[PDB]
């Protein structure tokens, strides 16, 4: 009751089970997944989507049941000399499967290359940083998101 | 495959298609443009830069482009005289159109 009655959370929309009927259920297990995403591409968290982050670092199955909750937390992350805390990898690799959680940070690129360093022309370093230093950006503010399940 | 596997190509960059899948999806008609340029001046041949060749000579568009190839050819272009037969445009008065 309190979570849906809470207006401090910017976004609370989910399906599989209607929120009003959640007060009468006794499901087996509850998963609490939390991470940080930019204010943009938040809708990509929903399953059956396609995008830079959705298909690559957190994919949800089409048989998913549970809810997604996101709220703004730009009061303690930005307005300083940079943030540089929350990394990510770019459009690379060979796509994702729902619920892997794979971390194999390594240097690779097409073009018949060896593995020695960065070497901008042939290879790249996959991961880089977010930037929320500007106060600008409705979809650039450092939002925080959690995803429950059933 | 004969051109892809050859090691004589210093640079082989493909746009919109990964090089080893072109034998699958077949396109209706292709093109083969050709010319001679410097070594450090190769990089102007790309979708939307600005230099001496991307504005006043053969210029790529912002649309789809295929695979651009280059290699070193100092073997048969040499000697004291210098191949002065080569020439380029350096006094154009306005920008160009894709494939002018």
């Amino acid at each position, epitope marked *: 009751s309190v979570l849906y009655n809470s207006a401090s959370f910017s976004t609370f929309k989910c399906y599989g089970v209607s929120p009003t009927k959640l007060n009468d259920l006794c499901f087996t297990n509850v998963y609490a997944d939390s991470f940080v995403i930019r204010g943009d591409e938040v809708r990509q968290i929903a399953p059956g989507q396609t995008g830079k982050i959705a298909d690559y670092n957190y994919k949800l199955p089409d048989d998913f049941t549970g809810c997604v909750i996101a709220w703004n937390s730009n009061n303690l992350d930005s307005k300083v*000399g940079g943030n540089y805390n929350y990394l990510y990898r770019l459009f690379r690799k060979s796509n994702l499967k729902p619920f892997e959680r794979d971390i194999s940070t390594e240097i690779y690129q097409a073009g018949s290359t060896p593995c020695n360093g960065v070497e901008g022309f042939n290879c790249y370093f996959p991961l880089q940083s977010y930037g929320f230093q500007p106060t600008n950006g409705v979809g650039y503010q450092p939002y925080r998101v959690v995803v429950l399940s059933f | 495959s004969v051109l892809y596997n050859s090691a004589s190509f210093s640079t082989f960059k493909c746009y919109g298609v990964s090089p080893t899948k072109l034998n699958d999806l077949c396109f209706t008609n292709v093109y083969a443009d050709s010319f001679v340029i410097r070594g450090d001046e190769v990089r102007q041949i790309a979708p939307g*830069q600005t230099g001496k060749i991307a504005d006043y000579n053969y210029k790529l568009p912002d649309d789809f482009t295929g695979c651009v190839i280059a290699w070193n050819s100092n073997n048969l272009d040499s000697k004291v005289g210098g191949n002065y037969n080569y020439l380029y445009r350096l*006094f154009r008065k306005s920008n160009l159109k894709p494939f002018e």
Partner: antibody
Amino acid sequence: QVQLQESGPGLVKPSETLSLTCTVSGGFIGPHYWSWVRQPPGKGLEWIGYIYISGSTNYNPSLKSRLTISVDMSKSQFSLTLSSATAADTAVYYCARGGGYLETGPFEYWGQGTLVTVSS
Amino acid sequence: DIVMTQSPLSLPVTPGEPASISCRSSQSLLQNNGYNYLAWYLQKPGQSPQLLIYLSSTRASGVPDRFSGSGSGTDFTLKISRVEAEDVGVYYCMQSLQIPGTFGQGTRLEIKR
């Protein structure tokens, strides 16, 4: 080798046209873009714009309403004209040789520098 | 516009040991080519700026081979293997991906004695 050099007035009245000239010596006509750049006192550097040999040019959007630039092949000189200036434009002006033409921006050579002051 | 940032703003370094200056960007710097465009200038007191690094990995003519850079995307780093008496000045980093091209605040290197 190329040795750039500026010349012009030092004091200008407010809301008056500003004229300078960066003469180029040594390396003559060629396929090289030329630019201009300035520096507020005790601050960072500010690039203005670049001009080609033929005359085609692109401008900084902030200063695209009251600034002009040309070229003259015979005298190996190019000039910068800035009109309706304010006191905020008092700075030192450098003329470059490479040009930051959104491609590589190799600033291969820089000038000595000229200081201009805006006052009545 | 895109704004450059550096860290720190002042740096005291004793001769002999390597140093490092970082310049972080606000937008991805990687054109349609495999190249990433960047520059690093050096302004000694009382003189005009000079070029040290362009394309972030190729030196300029006549520059001593002690300076180098690396990184791609939005992170780059310049290092000086051995500082000397003439390395007193203010360093800048330029982006040149698209118009306009603006510099940074300018790191001040200090030499100790």
